[PDB]
């Protein structure tokens, strides 16, 4: 359902630290509970030489903030990756400028998207792009975080 992808993406250049400044989902239940399955806080992106993308993140799981490390596998489309699961789920890079922000979505029709930024600051420009990107999409919950939260484990 996402029909916005980054043209000419260089996955090498998204390597490094990121902050989950905002997230949205197609269904409230996906982000509602703190332990919601798709409520995840991105830490670092580590593209591999073959062009896959390993992702370091945290998730609240069983009254604790856990580190998760997952791998999104490349596809023939540079902006589209696959996470192996019970169901095929696609990760799409919608837009990035590499140095400030990155917008991505994960889709199965359920959908979770985030606005990532390089620094713990509220980037009104990244957020406008995020909101513009999502006005297409049927989102029903949106969360955003302050710079104090961005510097805490699981944004507490
Ligand atoms: C450039 C764009 C940057 C891309 C960032 C992509 C982040 C995607 C993380 C979602 C995976 C996940 O939450 N997840 C998960 C975690 C807990 C419960 C249920 N589940 Rh679905 N799944 C499948 C396999 C592994 C993890 C997961």
From Swiss-Prot:
Transmembrane segments: none annotated. Under physiological conditions beta-lactoglobulin exists as an equilibrium mixture of monomeric and dimeric forms. Interaction with LMBR1L which mediates the endocytosis of LGB has been observed in PubMed:17991420, but not in PubMed:23964685. Synthesized in mammary gland and secreted in milk. Belongs to the calycin superfamily. Lipocalin family. Gene3D superfamilies: 2.40.128.20. This is Beta-lactoglobulin. The gene is LGB. Keywords: Allergen, Disulfide bond, Milk protein, Retinol-binding, Secreted, Signal, Transport. Disulfide bonds join 65-154, 105-113, 105-115. It comes from Bos taurus. InterPro entries: Blactoglobulin, Calycin, Lipocalin, Lipocalin_CS, Lipocln_cytosolic_FA-bd_dom. Changing residue 58 to H: In variant C; found only in the Jersey breed. GO terms for molecular function: identical protein binding; long-chain fatty acid binding; retinol binding. Coiled coil: none annotated.
């Amino acid at each position: 359902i996402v029909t916005q992808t980054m043209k000419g993406l260089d996955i090498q250049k998204v390597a490094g630290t990121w902050y989950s400044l905002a997230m949205a989902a197609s269904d409230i239940s996906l982000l509602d509970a703190q332990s919601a399955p798709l409520r995840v806080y991105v830490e670092e992106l580590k593209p591999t030489p073959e062009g896959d993308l390993e992702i370091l993140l945290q998730k609240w799981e069983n009254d604790e903030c856990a580190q998760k490390k997952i791998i999104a596998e490349k596809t023939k489309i540079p902006a589209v990756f696959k996470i192996d699961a019970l169901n095929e789920n696609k990760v799409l890079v919608l837009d990035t400028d590499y140095k400030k922000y990155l917008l991505f979505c994960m889709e199965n029709q359920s959908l979770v998207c985030q606005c990532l930024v390089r620094t713990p600051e509220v980037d009104d420009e990244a957020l406008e792009k995020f909101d513009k990107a999502l006005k297409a999409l049927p989102m029903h919950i949106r969360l955003s975080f302050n710079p104090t939260q961005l510097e805490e484990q699981c944004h507490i």
